[PDB]
Design a protein around this motif. Sequence first.
Motif, PDB file in Angstrom:
ATOM      1  N   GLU A 174       0.845  -1.180   0.000  1.00  0.00           N
ATOM      2  CA  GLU A 174       0.000   0.000   0.000  1.00  0.00           C
ATOM      3  C   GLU A 174       0.888   1.240   0.000  1.00  0.00           C
ATOM      4  O   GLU A 174       1.767   1.395   0.849  1.00  0.00           O
ATOM      5  N   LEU A 175       0.727   2.053  -1.038  1.00  0.00           N
ATOM      6  CA  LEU A 175       1.511   3.268  -1.176  1.00  0.00           C
ATOM      7  C   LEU A 175       0.730   4.435  -0.644  1.00  0.00           C
ATOM      8  O   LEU A 175      -0.461   4.587  -0.923  1.00  0.00           O
ATOM      9  N   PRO A 176       1.371   5.249   0.188  1.00  0.00           N
ATOM     10  CA  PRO A 176       0.644   6.398   0.730  1.00  0.00           C
ATOM     11  C   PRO A 176       0.397   7.479  -0.320  1.00  0.00           C
ATOM     12  O   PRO A 176       1.111   7.573  -1.328  1.00  0.00           O
ATOM     13  N   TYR A 177      -0.668   8.236  -0.102  1.00  0.00           N
ATOM     14  CA  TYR A 177      -1.053   9.320  -0.978  1.00  0.00           C
ATOM     15  C   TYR A 177      -0.134  10.527  -0.852  1.00  0.00           C
ATOM     16  O   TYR A 177       0.188  10.952   0.249  1.00  0.00           O
ATOM     17  N   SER A 178       0.213  11.110  -1.996  1.00  0.00           N
ATOM     18  CA  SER A 178       1.056  12.307  -2.052  1.00  0.00           C
ATOM     19  C   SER A 178       0.654  13.158  -3.259  1.00  0.00           C
ATOM     20  O   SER A 178       0.611  12.645  -4.385  1.00  0.00           O
ATOM     21  N   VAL A 179       0.326  14.437  -3.044  1.00  0.00           N
ATOM     22  CA  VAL A 179      -0.033  15.300  -4.182  1.00  0.00           C
ATOM     23  C   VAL A 179       1.198  15.500  -5.072  1.00  0.00           C
ATOM     24  O   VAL A 179       1.081  15.577  -6.292  1.00  0.00           O
ATOM     25  N   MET A 234      -4.960  22.241   5.408  1.00  0.00           N
ATOM     26  CA  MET A 234      -6.144  22.604   4.580  1.00  0.00           C
ATOM     27  C   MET A 234      -7.253  21.584   4.853  1.00  0.00           C
ATOM     28  O   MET A 234      -6.986  20.389   4.995  1.00  0.00           O
ATOM     29  N   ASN A 235      -8.490  22.060   4.956  1.00  0.00           N
ATOM     30  CA  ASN A 235      -9.638  21.187   5.224  1.00  0.00           C
ATOM     31  C   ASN A 235      -9.963  20.241   4.076  1.00  0.00           C
ATOM     32  O   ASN A 235      -9.743  20.566   2.909  1.00  0.00           O
ATOM     33  N   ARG A 236     -10.530  19.087   4.417  1.00  0.00           N
ATOM     34  CA  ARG A 236     -10.924  18.098   3.421  1.00  0.00           C
ATOM     35  C   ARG A 236     -11.999  18.722   2.535  1.00  0.00           C
ATOM     36  O   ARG A 236     -12.085  18.452   1.332  1.00  0.00           O
ATOM     37  N   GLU A 237     -12.827  19.551   3.156  1.00  0.00           N
ATOM     38  CA  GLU A 237     -13.885  20.243   2.451  1.00  0.00           C
ATOM     39  C   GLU A 237     -13.238  21.158   1.417  1.00  0.00           C
ATOM     40  O   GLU A 237     -13.567  21.110   0.229  1.00  0.00           O
ATOM     41  N   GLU A 238     -12.288  21.964   1.887  1.00  0.00           N
ATOM     42  CA  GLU A 238     -11.564  22.909   1.042  1.00  0.00           C
ATOM     43  C   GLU A 238     -10.798  22.216  -0.086  1.00  0.00           C
ATOM     44  O   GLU A 238     -10.598  22.798  -1.148  1.00  0.00           O
ATOM     45  N   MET A 239     -10.376  20.976   0.149  1.00  0.00           N
ATOM     46  CA  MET A 239      -9.657  20.211  -0.859  1.00  0.00           C
ATOM     47  C   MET A 239     -10.591  19.822  -1.995  1.00  0.00           C
ATOM     48  O   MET A 239     -10.256  19.993  -3.167  1.00  0.00           O
ATOM     49  N   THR A 240     -11.761  19.294  -1.641  1.00  0.00           N
ATOM     50  CA  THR A 240     -12.754  18.862  -2.629  1.00  0.00           C
ATOM     51  C   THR A 240     -13.262  20.052  -3.437  1.00  0.00           C
ATOM     52  O   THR A 240     -13.457  19.968  -4.651  1.00  0.00           O
ATOM     53  N   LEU A 241     -13.470  21.158  -2.731  1.00  0.00           N
ATOM     54  CA  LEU A 241     -13.947  22.401  -3.309  1.00  0.00           C
ATOM     55  C   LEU A 241     -12.934  22.901  -4.334  1.00  0.00           C
ATOM     56  O   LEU A 241     -13.278  23.120  -5.501  1.00  0.00           O
ATOM     57  N   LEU A 242     -11.692  23.087  -3.884  1.00  0.00           N
ATOM     58  CA  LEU A 242     -10.613  23.538  -4.752  1.00  0.00           C
ATOM     59  C   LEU A 242     -10.461  22.535  -5.898  1.00  0.00           C
ATOM     60  O   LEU A 242     -10.212  22.911  -7.039  1.00  0.00           O
ATOM     61  N   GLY A 243     -10.663  21.259  -5.589  1.00  0.00           N
ATOM     62  CA  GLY A 243     -10.578  20.231  -6.605  1.00  0.00           C
ATOM     63  C   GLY A 243     -11.575  20.493  -7.713  1.00  0.00           C
ATOM     64  O   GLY A 243     -11.236  20.407  -8.896  1.00  0.00           O
ATOM     65  N   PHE A 244     -12.815  20.791  -7.331  1.00  0.00           N
ATOM     66  CA  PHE A 244     -13.869  21.077  -8.303  1.00  0.00           C
ATOM     67  C   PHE A 244     -13.587  22.357  -9.088  1.00  0.00           C
ATOM     68  O   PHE A 244     -13.887  22.429 -10.257  1.00  0.00           O
ATOM     69  N   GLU A 245     -13.041  23.379  -8.428  1.00  0.00           N
ATOM     70  CA  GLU A 245     -12.720  24.634  -9.111  1.00  0.00           C
ATOM     71  C   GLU A 245     -11.682  24.393 -10.218  1.00  0.00           C
ATOM     72  O   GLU A 245     -11.814  24.904 -11.339  1.00  0.00           O
ATOM     73  N   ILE A 246     -10.667  23.592  -9.905  1.00  0.00           N
ATOM     74  CA  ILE A 246      -9.630  23.280 -10.880  1.00  0.00           C
ATOM     75  C   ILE A 246     -10.215  22.477 -12.039  1.00  0.00           C
ATOM     76  O   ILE A 246      -9.921  22.761 -13.199  1.00  0.00           O
ATOM     77  N   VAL A 247     -11.112  21.538 -11.740  1.00  0.00           N
ATOM     78  CA  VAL A 247     -11.749  20.759 -12.792  1.00  0.00           C
ATOM     79  C   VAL A 247     -12.553  21.699 -13.708  1.00  0.00           C
ATOM     80  O   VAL A 247     -12.497  21.586 -14.940  1.00  0.00           O
ATOM     81  N   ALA A 248     -13.290  22.632 -13.104  1.00  0.00           N
ATOM     82  CA  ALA A 248     -14.094  23.581 -13.881  1.00  0.00           C
ATOM     83  C   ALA A 248     -13.220  24.462 -14.796  1.00  0.00           C
ATOM     84  O   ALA A 248     -13.491  24.590 -15.994  1.00  0.00           O
ATOM     85  N   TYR A 249     -12.177  25.066 -14.233  1.00  0.00           N
ATOM     86  CA  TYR A 249     -11.282  25.913 -15.024  1.00  0.00           C
ATOM     87  C   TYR A 249     -10.603  25.126 -16.140  1.00  0.00           C
ATOM     88  O   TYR A 249     -10.539  25.588 -17.271  1.00  0.00           O
ATOM     89  N   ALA A 250     -10.073  23.955 -15.804  1.00  0.00           N
ATOM     90  CA  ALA A 250      -9.389  23.126 -16.785  1.00  0.00           C
ATOM     91  C   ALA A 250     -10.354  22.670 -17.856  1.00  0.00           C
ATOM     92  O   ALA A 250     -10.013  22.692 -19.039  1.00  0.00           O
ATOM     93  N   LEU A 256      -1.950  17.228   3.306  1.00  0.00           N
ATOM     94  CA  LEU A 256      -3.216  17.547   2.679  1.00  0.00           C
ATOM     95  C   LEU A 256      -4.132  16.346   2.733  1.00  0.00           C
ATOM     96  O   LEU A 256      -3.710  15.220   2.481  1.00  0.00           O
ATOM     97  N   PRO A 257      -5.402  16.571   3.088  1.00  0.00           N
ATOM     98  CA  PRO A 257      -6.379  15.493   3.166  1.00  0.00           C
ATOM     99  C   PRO A 257      -6.411  14.776   1.827  1.00  0.00           C
ATOM    100  O   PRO A 257      -6.276  15.398   0.772  1.00  0.00           O
ATOM    101  N   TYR A 258      -6.535  13.461   1.872  1.00  0.00           N
ATOM    102  CA  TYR A 258      -6.612  12.687   0.651  1.00  0.00           C
ATOM    103  C   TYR A 258      -7.890  13.103  -0.069  1.00  0.00           C
ATOM    104  O   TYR A 258      -8.984  13.022   0.490  1.00  0.00           O
ATOM    105  N   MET A 268      -9.535  16.288  -5.974  1.00  0.00           N
ATOM    106  CA  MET A 268      -8.317  17.060  -6.251  1.00  0.00           C
ATOM    107  C   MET A 268      -7.414  16.376  -7.264  1.00  0.00           C
ATOM    108  O   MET A 268      -6.790  17.029  -8.088  1.00  0.00           O
ATOM    109  N   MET A 269      -7.337  15.054  -7.224  1.00  0.00           N
ATOM    110  CA  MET A 269      -6.508  14.320  -8.177  1.00  0.00           C
ATOM    111  C   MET A 269      -7.069  14.527  -9.560  1.00  0.00           C
ATOM    112  O   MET A 269      -6.323  14.720 -10.523  1.00  0.00           O
TER     113      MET A 269
END
Lengths: 99, 104, 104
Positions: free
Chosen positions: B69-74, C1-17, C70-72, C76-77
């Motif tokens: 199991e590989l840990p998550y890393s951005v 950074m919050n897990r909430e903020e991660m998902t949010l920022l994740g969606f913003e990046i998806v939208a812009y991209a 950073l929360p998994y 965001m990925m």
Amino acid sequence: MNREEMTLLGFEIVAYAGDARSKLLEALKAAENGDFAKADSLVVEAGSCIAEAHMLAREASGEELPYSVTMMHGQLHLMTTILLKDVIHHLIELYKRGA
Amino acid sequence: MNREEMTLLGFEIVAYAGDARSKLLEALKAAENGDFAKADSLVVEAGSCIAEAHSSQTGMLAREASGEELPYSVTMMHGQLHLMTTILLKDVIHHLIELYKRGA
Amino acid sequence: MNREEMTLLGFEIVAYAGDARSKLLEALKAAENGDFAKADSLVVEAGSCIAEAHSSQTGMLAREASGEELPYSVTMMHGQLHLMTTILLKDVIHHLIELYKRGA
């Protein structure tokens, strides 16, 4: 899901994406050689592999989903391969106009 | 492996992929300017940087395939992205270069 | 950074991209048709969308490098995935348009 499922999912995607990629590169090869019919046919076949390869909603439907490098590798492969499918028309077209 | 380890490795992949990416883009600029020998030379060089990073990626994926199991890393995610997009560019760069050649 | 903020920022990046991506492919269609002014305008627009998403990514990544866990985030990925592949598209688009221009 658990890691194994995410991983197996990754593999199946890598599978379709790998096939589609091969056909797209083979298509470019065909177009390079002037065999434009083969290129178009190879592109349609690539399109088919991609069609079957096809998370965010799942994650949003809670949180979950275990991290899997194989799963991201599969997605990445699929996306980069789709990028190729999305521009291959132009590469081939430029070959035609060039010939 | 801990997140820190994956992160450090991620940087290593970024170092090689970023270098290869710069070389590939420089090769396109070269071809665009009619210096096809420079373009080809730069692709051969990029290929060497990609091979190094690609074998590491292959090793890491097999570790997971084998059960680890590989840990998550951005950062690792970023490295993988840099590498895979760079590989795609390399896979088709011959065609962009040839196209410049036929018109030039 | 919050897990909430991660998902949010994740969606913003998806939208812009996603936004940038559509423009780039629309740009390719414009160039193929000889509408160069339109193709270039779309690429400039796309580059502006990419810049905002890319700087977010740069900050997010620097947080992990500085030692922050950073929360998994799967969202965001995917943000990272679309953004990085769209950047690859932008690197390639320049040359595809130029090849079309020379062909014109």
